[PDB]
Amino acid sequence: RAQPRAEGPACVLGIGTAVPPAEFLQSEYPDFFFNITNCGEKEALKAKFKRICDKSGIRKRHMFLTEEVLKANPGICTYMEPSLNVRHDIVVVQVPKLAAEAAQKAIKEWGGRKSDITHIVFATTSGVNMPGADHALAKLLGLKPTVKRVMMYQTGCFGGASVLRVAKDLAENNKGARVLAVASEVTAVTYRAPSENHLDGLVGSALFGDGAGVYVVGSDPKPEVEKPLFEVHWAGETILPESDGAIDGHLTEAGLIFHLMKDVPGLISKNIEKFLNEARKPVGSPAWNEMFWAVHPGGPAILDQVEAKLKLTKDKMQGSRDILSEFGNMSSASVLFVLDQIRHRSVKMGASTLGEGSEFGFFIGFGPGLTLEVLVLRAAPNS
Amino acid sequence: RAQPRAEGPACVLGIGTAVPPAEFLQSEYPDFFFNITNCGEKEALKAKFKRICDKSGIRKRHMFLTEEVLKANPGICTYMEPSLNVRHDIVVVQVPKLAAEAAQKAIKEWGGRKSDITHIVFATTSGVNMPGADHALAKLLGLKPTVKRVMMYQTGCFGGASVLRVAKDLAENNKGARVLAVASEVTAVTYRAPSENHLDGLVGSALFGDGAGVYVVGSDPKPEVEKPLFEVHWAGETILPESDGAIDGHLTEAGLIFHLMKDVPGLISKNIEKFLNEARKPVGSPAWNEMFWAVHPGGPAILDQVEAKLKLTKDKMQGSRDILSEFGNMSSASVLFVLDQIRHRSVKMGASTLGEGSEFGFFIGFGPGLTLEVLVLRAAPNS
Numbered sequence: 001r002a003q004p005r006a007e008g009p010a011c012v013l014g015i016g017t018a019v020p021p022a023e024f025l026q027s028e029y030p031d032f033f034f035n036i037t038n039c040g041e042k043e044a045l046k047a048k049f050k051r052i053c054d055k056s057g058i059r060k061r062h063m064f065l066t067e068e069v070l071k072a073n074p075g076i077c078t079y080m081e082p083s084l085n086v087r088h089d090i091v092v093v094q095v096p097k098l099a100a101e102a103a104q105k106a107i108k109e110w111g112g113r114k115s116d117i118t119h120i121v122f123a124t125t126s127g128v129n130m131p132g133a134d135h136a137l138a139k140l141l142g143l144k145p146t147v148k149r150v151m152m153y154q155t156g157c158f159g160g161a162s163v164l165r166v167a168k169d170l171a172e173n174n175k176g177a178r179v180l181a182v183a184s185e186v187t188a189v190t191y192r193a194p195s196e197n198h199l200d201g202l203v204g205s206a207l208f209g210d211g212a213g214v215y216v217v218g219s220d221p222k223p224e225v226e227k228p229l230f231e232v233h234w235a236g237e238t239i240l241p242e243s244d245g246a247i248d249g250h251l252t253e254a255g256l257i258f259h260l261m262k263d264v265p266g267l268i269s270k271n272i273e274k275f276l277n278e279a280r281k282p283v284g285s286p287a288w289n290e291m292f293w294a295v296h297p298g299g300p301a302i303l304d305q306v307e308a309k310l311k312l313t314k315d316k317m318q319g320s321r322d323i324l325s326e327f328g329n330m331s332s333a334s335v336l337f338v339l340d341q342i343r344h345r346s347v348k349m350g351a352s353t354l355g356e357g358s359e360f361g362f363f364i365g366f367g368p369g370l371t372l373e374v375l376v377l378r379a380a381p382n383s
Numbered sequence: 384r385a386q387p388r389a390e391g392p393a394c395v396l397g398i399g400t401a402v403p404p405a406e407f408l409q410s411e412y413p414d415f416f417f418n419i420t421n422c423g424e425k426e427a428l429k430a431k432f433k434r435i436c437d438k439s440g441i442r443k444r445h446m447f448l449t450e451e452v453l454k455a456n457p458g459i460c461t462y463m464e465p466s467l468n469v470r471h472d473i474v475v476v477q478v479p480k481l482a483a484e485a486a487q488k489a490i491k492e493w494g495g496r497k498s499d500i501t502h503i504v505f506a507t508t509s510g511v512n513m514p515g516a517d518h519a520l521a522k523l524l525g526l527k528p529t530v531k532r533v534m535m536y537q538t539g540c541f542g543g544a545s546v547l548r549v550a551k552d553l554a555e556n557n558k559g560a561r562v563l564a565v566a567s568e569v570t571a572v573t574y575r576a577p578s579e580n581h582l583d584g585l586v587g588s589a590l591f592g593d594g595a596g597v598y599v600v601g602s603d604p605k606p607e608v609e610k611p612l613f614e615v616h617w618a619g620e621t622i623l624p625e626s627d628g629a630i631d632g633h634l635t636e637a638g639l640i641f642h643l644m645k646d647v648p649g650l651i652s653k654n655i656e657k658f659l660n661e662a663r664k665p666v667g668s669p670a671w672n673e674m675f676w677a678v679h680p681g682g683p684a685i686l687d688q689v690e691a692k693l694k695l696t697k698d699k700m701q702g703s704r705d706i707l708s709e710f711g712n713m714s715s716a717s718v719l720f721v722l723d724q725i726r727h728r729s730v731k732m733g734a735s736t737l738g739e740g741s742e743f744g745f746f747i748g749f750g751p752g753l754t755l756e757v758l759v760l761r762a763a764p765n766s
């Protein structure tokens with residue numbers, strides 16, 4: 001084998017997360033949003049938006065789009081005026097810059113040298129460019145120019161699971177390989193003024209926030225330097241039955257526009273157990289309540305119905321609900337925060353593993369397709 | 384290992400290509416192009432465009448944008464009027480449709496069942512959508528809903544090499560895995576009226592054409608059932624020094640806008656030997672003239688200077704020049720055609736291998752970065 005393969009399973013070797021500094025309280029967002037878009041007279045619409053915010057499960061979100069930025073780019077504050085170029089001017093720098101913030105933290109925890117990074121896997125939903133955010137991230141961090149890159153533009157909310165799936169095969173098939181798995185999201189491509197005829201707009205405006213997470217992934221950890229946090233044992237995905245059209249997203253002259261023509265929480269709840277039953281098997285099929293649950297917090301409804309359908313104890317979804325609460329829906333980056341939050345809860349409560357006492361757990365994303373992405377991890381001991 | 388790995392190197396097991404039916408002869412293209420965009424008064428510009436066409440090394444190209452289609456979508460015939468929406472209406476269907484035509488041919492040559500495809504790796508430069516072209520192709524072909532997908536939107540011309548690099552790790556790390564490696568391009572997202580303000584555009588308008596290629600990639604071929612055409616032994620890439628901005632692409636309200644710098648052939652030719660010297664080593668560093676050369680035909684100047692710098696014999700670049708001649712630059716798909724052409728030339732001339740008698744060869748792409756992508760292949764014997 002002309003490029004020698006690695007021996008052990010892929011491991012998460014370090015985690016880093018990052019958010020823009022400005023915070024937006026959900027209890028105050030309807031006034032700010034409808035004012036900055038000059039729609040404050042639309043009382044009935046604002047009341048509807050408030051209902052959505054009140055049901056969202058979100059306390060605050062981080063966003064680069066401050067009052068100053070929005071006043072400086074009025075095109076983004078319209079409903080459908082052509083604005084894609086001013087949108088890309090914001091996200092082309094912020095998306096890799098935020099990723100670099102998170103990547104420095106992940107490398108610090110890992111303990112290795114930046115010059116030993118061999119691969120980058122990068123997901124986003126926030127605009128596109130040539131060369132891509134992967135290339136920018138390599139420059140910002142001063143990586144070696146021979147770094148091997150996989151740039152997954154335009155994924156939607158399953159992309160965090162995607163980067164860990166791809167990193168697994170890259171780390172497992174290349175002796176010595178150390179991968180940066182990256183997901184970074186900035187809401188400037190999707191932001192727009194509220195409208196009575198765009199209800200999916202209303203929901204996105206209540207849910208989406210900014211953030212980035214990156215993991216260092218690698219097989220065969222050097223014992224004198226590297227400490228694995230999680231092992232990756234299985235990765236797969238499926239398209240759910242009769243889900244055509246559930247989530248559509250079109251990049252247009254006015255930015256990214258979503259249309260949701262099916263019951264997404266219902267589609268996932270009705271189908272998740274059959275597929276999760278398959279993922280369990282290669283690790284001996286533990287019971288749902290013997291596992292940890294790093295679930296993408298697309299919204300409170302999806303977390304609730306999965307909790308009920310599987311009869312999970314209330315602590316299982318707490319990691320996900322914490323992230324929803326403090327950061328909202330950061331699209332592909334969210335699930336990376338969730339796993340991190342489960343690790344932190346484990347340390348704070350003195351559990352025996354970094355999966356809150358459980359040995360195996362799920363790392364789950366979903367999005368357009370309707371696509372369900374699932375990985376199975378093993379948690380390290382908490383020493 | 385909870386998902387068992389494969390044993391042998393990844394193999395190309397079948398090849399398929401496809402193009403839209405309409406043909407555009409290069410010697411007449413300046414008349415048609417300047418006609419249909421109502422630019423016939425720009426005589427000086429048209430003379431320059433003809434000079435480019437005559438030096439391009441291109442005899443004809445295939446394009447979906449026929450006279451009737453262009454007349455029916457007048458926004459695409461403008462310089463900068465907003466047109467991204469009707470452009471995406473074309474490429475969101477045509478890009479996967481073209482891929483499906485090439486994939487059927489590749490699957491027929493492979494001989495396996497479509498239900499045994501496990502993976503899709505998909506590159507393109509022709510717009511974006513959610514769900515992606517990968518999902519559309521899975522639907523059109525009737526693949527399993529559990530197919531694992533990697534969608535590299537917005538790669539530029541190195542993406543053909545990219546999909547094979549990714550396919551290598553996916554096939555080598557998964558026992559029984561059979562991957563569809565796909566690259567598909569349609570020029571409707573980049574086409575626009577010629578202008579004295581966008582001379583880079585003139586070169587793009589002379590070079591780019593439509594096409595798609597797909598390879599079946601897999602390790603461990605079942606003897607007497609599957610016949611490998613090439614083995615993949617090495618894959619790497621590098622960013623060339625001081626080449627920021629050589630190739631740029633931004634997706635805007637008016638479609639995709641490229642920047643192409645006069646230095647590109649020089650940047651590649653002045654650096655390629657140094658890197659290829661390294662890629663050679665894991666297979667024993669064969670001599671340049673003992674290898675075959677599947678090189679992305681970005682332009683005639685690039686092929687010419689690489690041939691000179693490396694002192695290659697005149698037959699080494701013929702495969703690339705054939706593809707340039709008959710199809711032009713089909714961005715990420717082009718190099719997939721080149722390898723297929725080298726196999727056909729081998730058979731036609733009765734060579735001893737499918738690499739025109741050589742044992743090892745390069746599969747080379749380049750694009751925004753400036754990124755150089757290289758794989759090292761071994762050719763099968765010619766029985």
Ligand SMILES: CC(C)(COP(=O)(O)OP(=O)(O)OC[C@H]1O[C@@H](n2cnc3c(N)ncnc32)[C@H](O)[C@@H]1OP(=O)(O)O)[C@@H](O)C(=O)NCCC(=O)NCCS
Pocket residue numbers: 431434435438439540582583586590643644645647648681682683684685712749750
């Ligand atoms: C385009 C190409 C065929 C030009 O042919 P050539 O043999 O170099 O001949 P010339 O230098 O006379 O070029 C012809 C004309 O194109 C112009 N031209 C070439 N490259 C240009 C560029 N990047 N931008 C603008 N004009 C360009 C020249 O200035 C010249 O104009 P002129 O007739 O008014 O002097 C050749 O330079 C080439 O293959 N370039 C690389 C293409 C490329 O970058 N690949 C696409 C993406 S990888």
